């Protein structure tokens, strides 16, 4: 019993538009693969997680116009929400060309939270740093996003580089 992911994606253009206006951000929102089908029981559950990722992109990712110009970047930020099938799973991606997740900030927070000390933090790989955002209570919150995705028997990944932006990938079972 599947339905097009458009049942999830449809309310986003409006919400992204309002969030950007409200945060004085200029964002061009692009949705791809809205016809991609997924279990209808996933529809309600996955909406909240995706909205949070979109909000993070507009809030923490896309920089104010003045800052983007200072970086030699396109004046308007780009936010892409896509869906597609990859074998036996539905792949959903949220990608922005914003400032990227501040990895030093994450390390500092992890240390203060008592999750690691200075010594071990110094050698963490970029991916190991980003994964701290998945720890329950670290942060709503990427930790809750990961938990909900997991409750759907899915998986989540994060990719982010300074000034390039951030891409969050969610994989849900194709059942």
Ligand X SMILES: Nc1ncnc2c1ncn2[C@@H]1O[C@H](COP(=O)(O)OP(=O)(O)O)[C@@H](O)[C@H]1O
Q: Which residues bind to ligand ACP, rule: CB under 6 A?
A: 52, 56-57, 60-61, 96, 98-101, 140-142, 166
**SS3 category, 14:** helix
Are 29 and 81 spatial neighbours (Cβ–Cβ below 8 Å)? yes
Q: Which of 29, 166, 170, 171 binds ligand X (CB under 6 A)?
A: 166
56 in contact with Mg ion (CB under 5 A): yes
Are 104 and 94 spatial neighbours (Cβ–Cβ below 8 Å)? no
How many residues are present in the chain? 175
Kindly state the smallest distance separating residue 35's Cβ from ligand ACP, in Å. Answer: 25
Kindly state the smallest distance separating residue 31's Cβ from Mg ion, in Å. Answer: 20
**Contact region for ligand X (CB under 6 A) — 23-31, 57-65, 69-77, 84-92?**
57-65
**Cβ closest to its own copies, residue 86 vs residue 112:** 86
74-103 core/surface letters (b: 16 or more CB in 10 A; e: else): eeebbbbbbbeeeeebbbbbbbbbbbbbeb
Nearest to 82 by CA among 34, 17, 29, 146: 34
133 in contact with ligand X (CB under 6 A): yes
Kindly state the smallest distance separating residue 105's Cβ from Mg ion, in Å. Answer: 15
Scan for tokens 């529809």, then name that residue. Answer: 43
Query: Interface residues with ligand X (CB under 6 A)?
Result: 56-57, 60-61, 96, 98-102, 105, 133, 139-142, 166
């Amino acid at each position: 019993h599947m339905v097009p992911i458009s049942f999830v994606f449809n309310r986003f253009p409006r919400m992204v538009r309002d969030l950007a206006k409200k945060m004085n951000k200029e964002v061009n929102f692009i949705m791809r693969g809205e016809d991609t089908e997924l279990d209808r029981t996933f529809v309600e559950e996955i909406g909240e997680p995706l909205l949070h990722l979109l909000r993070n992109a507009i809030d923490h990712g896309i920089e104010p116009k003045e800052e983007r110009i200072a970086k030699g970047k396109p004046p308007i930020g780009t936010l892409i929400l896509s869906a597609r099938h990859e074998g036996n799973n539905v792949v959903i991606e949220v990608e922005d060309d914003g400032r990227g997740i501040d990895k030093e900030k994450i390390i500092r927070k992890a240390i203060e939270k008592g999750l690691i000390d200075e010594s071990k933090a110094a050698t963490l790989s970029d991916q190991e740093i980003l994964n701290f955002l998945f720890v329950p209570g670290f942060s709503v919150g990427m930790d809750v996003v990961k938990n909900v995705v997991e409750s759907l028997n899915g998986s989540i990944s994060i990719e982010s580089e300074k000034d390039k932006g951030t891409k969050v990938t969610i994989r849900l079972p194709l059942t």
